[PDB]
Amino acid sequence: STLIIPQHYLRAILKVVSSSSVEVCGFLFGKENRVLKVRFIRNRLNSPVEFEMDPEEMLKALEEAEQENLEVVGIFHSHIACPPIPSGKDLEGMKRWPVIWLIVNEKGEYKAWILNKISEVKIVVE
Amino acid sequence: STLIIPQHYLRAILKVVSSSSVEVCGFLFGKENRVLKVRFIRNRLNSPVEFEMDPEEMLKALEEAEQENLEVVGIFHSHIACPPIPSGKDLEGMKRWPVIWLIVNEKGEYKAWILSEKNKISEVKIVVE
């Protein structure tokens, strides 16, 4: 498993994360394992230790991707301070949404994960 | 659930954690939801970011507890410089050991966790008495 993401999209995510006091989250839209569009979604928990997508904004984003013939390649979110490795609650979310999970933090670290076996996904930056 | 822990036991755990450069781990032995004995167990990973109990010591601790008519109320361990919230590895362990998981850190924070009837992470109220 690999995740192919354009450099400028990953840098844009990292830049938002570097300025956020709460966990950030959103969708990686595209095709196969290739990211073609990034969509931030509001973290309705407003929290530095967990996230939950605003459901109305989530549905709107999914509708817009469908209109554009895009699929959900992944879910991305950030951690504050701690490493980009799934938490226990993250693993529960990966079972609900078994796509690629990209995790980043404010130190510029990034790793990707996919599902009862969890494996790291190699990130290919383009 | 609710976890009732004596104040001097929780203080002892937190002050050991404050002085430790690796994750600390052990058993909370007792009755029902009441901690009656704290037993530290070597972290065989000798790691600041994860833990695993030395099997040798783990077995002895459980037979000692049995000799005193005590049951496993919980497992406790520490995180260093991260919130006291279950890691992904912790969740795997919580499914193998469905008891209360008390997590602390070097900032003196402490939270407790169990898996619900749907096997989801759920927070447990801690009563310090």
Ligand SMILES: [Cl-]
């Ligand atoms: Cl263990």
Ligand SMILES: [Zn+2]
């Ligand atoms: Zn996370």
Ligand SMILES: [Zn+2]
């Ligand atoms: Zn842990």
